């Protein structure tokens with residue numbers, strides 16, 4: 001253990017030749033601290049009486065859990081103090097947060113402080129999702145600086161509070177996974193340069209919405225259950241927490257779906273702090289992320305709380321679904 005390959009070091013080493021100010025290291029170190037604090041709280045939530053609701057509703061009309069409040073405060077406070085940020089967008093706040101002049105840095109951060117709210121009380125895996133942009137304007141920071149297409153991301157990733165706590169970080173040249181060592185409070189590199197398989201054998205979707213699915217999603221699911229070539233049908237997995245289903249898709253291959261449907265023209269998941277970060281991870285891992293008609297990373301948002309359909313995973317799987325959408329167009 002006398003040579004610890006920490007997230008901090010990894011991020012510093014890799015970007016030593018590319019010169020720079022080092023605020024990204026500052027930013028990520030800061031986020032790592034929030035993530036450890038959130039992990040620790042989650043791991044003892046029932047004894048700390050942190051299960052249950054807060055007594056409020058966010059703009060996308062969700063019921064605010066107590067862990068939502070704690071996680072949101074922790075992430076906002078550490079990013080503010082990092083001296084690396086100017087504009088913050090969170091699922092739990094109606095408007096973009098503008099950092100005080102004294103603490104401003106060059107980055108814009110979009111995040112979901114706690115993802116998988118419906119799974120909190122039953123102890124299923126939950127997580128934290130983030131996407132980081134460089135501010136491009138030269139005028140005063142504002143919500144508009146958050147309204148960039150996902151392809152403009154410079155880093156993105158998530159923390160998974162699962163059987164272990166994992167920080168998955170994607171940047172311009174690839175994806176790397178760091179596991180939290182709970183004894184020393186450090187994220188250790190455990191998977192380098194992760195790449196998704198070209199084709200998997202698991203599909204992930206909430207089939208409770210079958211009555212509302214479009215014909216293409218309907219056809220695809222039927223094909224996973226009854227393959228026309230006598231191959232083995234795909235297995236099904238749906239934890240119910242985007243971070244957990246997407247993490248599995250990344251390391252085992254396959255496809256994850258939260259499509260548009262008859263009641264939800266743009267799906268459920270939020271483009272800025274759920275769909276773009278996972279789409280970015282997936283594309284840097286050799287995967288694809290589509291709405292069924294266009295690349296998620298190419299959408300130009302007009303609303304920080306905008307929703308988007310998302311279909312992601314192994315490229316041959318996502319492509320097969322796109323072919324079906326194309327055929328039905």
Ligand SMILES: O=P(O)(O)OC[C@H]1O[C@](O)(CO)[C@@H](O)[C@@H]1O
Pocket residue numbers: 115116117118206240241242243268269
């Ligand atoms: O209950 P549903 O509609 O399947 O929604 C589950 C999805 O909702 C979320 O909790 C976000 O609200 C995601 O983490 C998860 O993928």
Ligand SMILES: [Mg+2]
Pocket residue numbers: 112114115116117242274
């Ligand atoms: Mg979420």
Ligand SMILES: [Mg+2]
Pocket residue numbers: 091112113114115116117
């Ligand atoms: Mg959330």
Ligand SMILES: [Mg+2]
Pocket residue numbers: 062063117
């Ligand atoms: Mg929620």
